[PDB]
Design a protein around this ligand. Structure first.
Ligand code: UKH
Ligand code: UKH
Lengths: 307, 298, 305
């Protein structure tokens, strides 16, 4: 059976642990695994460009021995003059895996329903599961065992990072709190899936508007930009609601004394996170960015071996 | 002494047979030929984007051991900052071959007359000769011998696939029929070149507006996108009714993308006669064979 | 060890430049014999403004060192700080190659990156092209020390500045022939004058193109106008016509003189067909040598850093 990775809970707790261990092994020995030797191809397709996502995948695929064929948004968007199913059938003849950045989850589902190679969600509207693998690798590096840790996410609680932190976090046994204003709460289906997965791992899900309560006793504090490019014209003031949730020094001081801070780059210094927090000793954002390379390579190695 | 591939008949019948044999060998052993090991470079230049063309060449060059340097939209189209002759001299210092998607054929001929490395027409307004190499590879693996098969192309008979199926088909000994409406017939000079080449191979060239007669007894049925501004092409749709008139075990080809419901139906596209998925994959193998062959003689 | 950068031509001492140029000759002869980036290791190649010629040379050169070039096109400083970019890239790649505009941006990146930073091309310098030029001159003429080189045209552009600095580092007597108002930046000119003291070279700036051509071993020109200057308000044709590198000018130089021009050339403006395509032209070898000289520079910086 062909395995895909479209959202964080596509891996069981045991499987996620396997991928995270592989990510640590690959960080130590980055060119020791060559499942794409040849080179074999991997398609890396962007319905909307993401330079950082392309950078890490392109280099990582090369270090697995392969050749990434990158298709940027300058090409005709998939689905516009050929069905996704037809594209999947041809790609399955050319490459050993399909890495895709797209929008709605239904598009990823349609591709994965037909492709005979693994399909990976590089980044989408609803989830960012590869970044959360990198996040979990980073937390393990700086904290040790993930089970039982307390992680709080602040800001827009319905964006892709909030959803993947919920799903990926509870899969790892982490107690996850989303601190967000009313009207910006996690998708109910994602929250229910996280609550169910949490029953298997001893984790828990909390959603609150009380940012100070969310930070108290936290081991990991996370935030992300308050607005995606697609949201700039949605009509909302996307600054005023989030100001109480800014990851600043006062908020960090409420957390456990050994707490660390994560943020997917790019960051907007002075909005969701302050310079003092970005550049202080609690910040893990630089290691986090680097671990995108290793965690994505580990995911590819794992999916290719299982598929 | 430096060989180019700008149109289908740039290869003789014997040379075409060599390239198709190489494509079959490379399909079976895709990293066994490493003429570009190093890596040595190959330029892949697009005056107009073609993602599918870029995709197959880029991966194929890598599997020959090389590094494709791709110049597409956003990067500099050739001849805007310097003469094409100046570009050809510098490229000949950097890469071992030049793969170019451009429009008019006078631009390809100009490059090829100056460059001292092989120039390949990746796709042009007048010819699509790499796709036809992939088509011939697909027909051979489904049918065996190409000589004496009947191939019919339906739809726009003035586009690059019609021209290349004429030239490449008769070069392989295939009897080629183009079924097209009156405003969309092959370029007369291309048709004449195909009729001449067919004399050497025992093939033939037929142009007709009668889609039923073109489908009757055909072994290979081919179509392509038509672009109601498509009224004249509707009688030429590859549907189940047309396919039912062909020889037993006939196959259907279509350079992708396909507009399902226009030039070809779901039933034909997804049925047992369709070979469009193997055909798409064989662009990789046939283009690698072409490059290996041109590099060995250049 | 100190991380070494190459942002302008005099970032290499005379002895260091000689080492890089010797390595360029070795790599031209044996282009896959140095594999410091085997793995592959990454090299970031970043363009604030796209340059297809720069991309081709670096992309292929990095690959021939065993590495993988990760190209980032103009389609830095906007989404995140240059310091933030340097921190993260220093974790991904073994070197940063950057085409940008003002020199202060290169300086800032190099001040904080923990891997070598290379100026691929900037508004003020083009030091990789001048390494390729020096490699070409050495192939055609042998020892560089004591040669006389004259550059004609816009005397304040990146090629004029780098021919001054890189030329006098190699011991070449450099003349810049340019009209009033188009003269080398004073700081660059003073730096070249000081460096020329160390090598026995010299710096000459003149408006007399005929005097600059007489006795020259190497004649160089470049486009009169960069893309960012097309809207600067000046007539950028009339001042430069007396400085065209044509057959009459070349005839004034030494009988064995060679001609250089960083491509692309606008035939009929700064250079003529007869010169460009005649036996004195070295422009094609010069373009090829971008590949070899940049590979040599990368090998050298990586080993020193
Ligand atoms: O995932 N990457 O490749 C990547 C690259 C660069 C950055 B950075 O400059 O912000 C971040 C991430
Ligand atoms: O030649 N290729 O690489 C290629 C790639 C993709 C397609 B397709 O999705 O239709 C077709 C051809």
């Amino acid at each position: 059976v062909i395995r895909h990775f479209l959202r964080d809970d596509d891996l069981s707790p045991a499987e996620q642990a396997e991928v995270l261990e592989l990510a640590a092994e690959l960080k130590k020995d980055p060119v020791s695994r060559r499942p794409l030797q040849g080179p074999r191809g991997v398609a890396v397709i962007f319905d909307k460009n993401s330079t950082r996502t392309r950078f890490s995948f392109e280099l990582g695929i090369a270090q697995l021995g392969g050749h990434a064929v990158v298709v940027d948004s300058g090409s005709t968007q998939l689905g516009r003059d050929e069905t996704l199913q037809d594209t999947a059938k041809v790609l399955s003849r050319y490459v050993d895996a399909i890495v895709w950045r797209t929008f709605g989850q239904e598009r990823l589902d349609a591709m994965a329903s037909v492709a005979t190679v693994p399909v990976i969600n590089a980044l989408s509207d609803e989830f960012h599961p590869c970044q959360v693998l990198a996040d979990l690798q980073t937390i393990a590096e700086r904290k040790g065992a993930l089970r039982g840790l307390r992680l709080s996410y602040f800001g827009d609680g319905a964006n892709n990072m909030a959803h993947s932190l919920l799903l990926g976090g509870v899969t790892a046994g982490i107690h996850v709190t989303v601190a967000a204003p009313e009207g910006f709460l996690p998708d109910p289906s994602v929250r229910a899936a996280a609550e169910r997965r949490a029953q298997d791992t001893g984790a828990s899900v909390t959603v609150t508007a009380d940012a100070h309560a969310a930070a108290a006793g936290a081991d990991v504090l996370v935030t992300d930009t308050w607005t995606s490019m697609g949201q700039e014209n949605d009509g909302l003031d996307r600054v005023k609601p989030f100001r109480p949730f800014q990851l600043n020094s006062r908020l960090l001081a409420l957390a456990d004394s050994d707490a660390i801070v994560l943020h997917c780059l790019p960051a907007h210094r002075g909005d969701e996170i302050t310079d003092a927090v970005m550049d202080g000793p609690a910040s893990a954002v630089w290691d986090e960015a680097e671990n995108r390379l290793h965690a994505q390579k580990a995911l590819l190695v794992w999916l290719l071996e299982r598929s």
